[PDB]
Ligand binder design. Sequence first.
Ligand SMILES: Nc1ccn([C@H]2C[C@H](O)[C@@H](COP(=O)(O)OP(=O)(O)OP(=O)(O)O)O2)c(=O)n1
Ligand SMILES: OC[C@H]1O[C@@](CO)(O[C@H]2O[C@H](CO)[C@@H](O)[C@H](O)[C@H]2O)[C@@H](O)[C@@H]1O
Ligand SMILES: OC[C@H]1O[C@@](CO)(O[C@H]2O[C@H](CO)[C@@H](O)[C@H](O)[C@H]2O)[C@@H](O)[C@@H]1O
Ligand SMILES: [Mg+2]
Length: 580
Amino acid sequence: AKMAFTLADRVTEEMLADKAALVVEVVEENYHDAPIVGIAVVNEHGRFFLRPETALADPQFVAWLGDETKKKSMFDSKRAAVALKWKGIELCGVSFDLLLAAYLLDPAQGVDDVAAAAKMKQYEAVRPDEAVYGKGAKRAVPDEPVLAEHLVRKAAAIWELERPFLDELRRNEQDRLLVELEQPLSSILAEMEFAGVKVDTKRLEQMGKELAEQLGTVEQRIYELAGQEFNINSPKQLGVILFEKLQLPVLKKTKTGYSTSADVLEKLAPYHEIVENILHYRQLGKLQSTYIEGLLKVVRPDTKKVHTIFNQALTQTGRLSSTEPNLQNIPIRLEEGRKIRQAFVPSESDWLIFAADYSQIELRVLAHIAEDDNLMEAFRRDLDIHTKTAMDIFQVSEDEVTPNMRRQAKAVNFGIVYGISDYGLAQNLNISRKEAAEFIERYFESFPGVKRYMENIVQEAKQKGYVTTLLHRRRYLPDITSRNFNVRSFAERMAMNTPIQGSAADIIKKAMIDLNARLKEERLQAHLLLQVHDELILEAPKEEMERLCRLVPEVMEQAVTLRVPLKVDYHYGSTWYDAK
DNA sequence: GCGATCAGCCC
DNA sequence: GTGCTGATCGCA
Ligand SMILES: Nc1ccn([C@H]2C[C@H](O)[C@@H](COP(=O)(O)OP(=O)(O)OP(=O)(O)O)O2)c(=O)n1
Ligand SMILES: OC[C@H]1O[C@@](CO)(O[C@H]2O[C@H](CO)[C@@H](O)[C@H](O)[C@H]2O)[C@@H](O)[C@@H]1O
Ligand SMILES: OC[C@H]1O[C@@](CO)(O[C@H]2O[C@H](CO)[C@@H](O)[C@H](O)[C@H]2O)[C@@H](O)[C@@H]1O
Ligand SMILES: [Mg+2]
């Protein structure tokens, strides 16, 4: 039964009520400078469809969009806000975002369109976007009659679903999480994405030619050491060369065949000179194809900026993710790849990059939630946590901690957070389970509070069916009762790790909101560019660095109040690389 | 063209 | 523990 609506040729006062479900459709996955194909509005007066060229040129409509007293309910308001920013139009007054609401109610549903959200409440009078637009090479905007009905049905669903979703969020004690954290954050991310990050393409291109030369030398050497040419980028062909022609021992296999992972190769290095060159080739090739060519592909030719898109409704822990490009995995550990960061520069002359990062926020959060006396005292003394853990599990004085002992203690600390397992640790430390388990038992002996938390949180997950973070983010764990050991164990690790990683996510999100407000009150030109899980990257006039050195760490350290202090380190320079 | 595999980068 | 990307491969 078709849905009734007015396919308007002009904008009327009736369409500008102070409460409405609004749809500003952007079909392209990457919404930066992308087309708005249609508009739909549903309010107390009816349902309307408006052509973009018409509405967006209407002075009254544009004013309505930018009036914060005129409330709008939408799905993925950031997409619409950014597409509008590229057209010089401000979107204000978004009081409800169905995507973010659905995300908070259950991140596991993977809601990515209105239909999926509506299905959560048995509402099915709307089609999935993929059904209307198709996918891949077949993707396409349908004729006006089909498009208009779809957009109106989406607006209609949003209009109907707002109350039931808000009611459930309220029952879950998550309504403030939506209204005071995620929605305000959505507007901040929109600003960051739109601003973009300036890239020194000349610098990137120069590095690219250096690697092209280095890869050519190592490539030929590999063929030389192998006695023939083959596709190194082919694990299949590489395996034949290594485990058949050169007879290297098979230490590990994959579902399909021989493993050629870096971890395995390192062990085979002693047997043949070719292995070292394969490792080098893998290093250079990764930088060339992924960080040089891949980054250059998404830089905008006119402005030389990259405009990432932060997916705010994807991770099961509350973290943000980044795409096109993913600016959350730019090399830094290895010096060769770290140089890539010299390519990210300030967008204005005489401006600099400022970066601030939380120091061990996950372990501090664990100290707080577990109320472990030993761990809390360690952070109150601001001790090197890995050295301290080594002293405790190995029963030695600070002076007796060797470099290897600290390395292994650090591995134990990472596991503890990321759901400890006498299997993942061993594999990571190149040791056995019995041994790894011995380290774990020693850890819990030194940190009994953490042991109690791990036991209690798993019990809570089983009883309630989910675990929660500091700001009430939730994650359901139905597999916690599984009779399959591996399936159940993974759920148990999630029960232990989500409150830690998730609370850390809550904190940095609140810090971003607090910082944006402080920068405005202070009348500073500085602004946020990126977020990388536990760090914030900004750019600003060189004349504002001194003020930022005091302001940013303070705002981040005071975002929330825990049983232990929060610590923030900071640096600034002419490029992202120098902000070290 | 498209999806399963493999690999490797970040926190 | 959470993510995103690129080169191969054989399939359609
Ligand atoms: N109705 C609610 C209540 C809480 N929360 C989430 C976000 C809040 O920041 C957090 C803590 O809620 P509290 O009830 O503890 O309120 P505050 O912690 O904000 O106030 P108080 O200092 O009284 O604890 O839980 C929410 O989303 N919706
Ligand atoms: O606008 C981002 C928002 O849209 C979703 C779908 O509702 O993801 C789409 O857009 C992303 C950005 O280009 C793509 O990575 C993704 O593949 C596409 O489906 C949400 O997941 C996201 O929160
Ligand atoms: O010269 C291209 C040609 O070489 C092969 C093997 O001889 O692959 C080599 O070059 C590719 C492009 O740089 C790499 O991806 C690959 O790892 C390297 O061995 C052929 O497959 C290709 O047609
Ligand atoms: Mg850090």
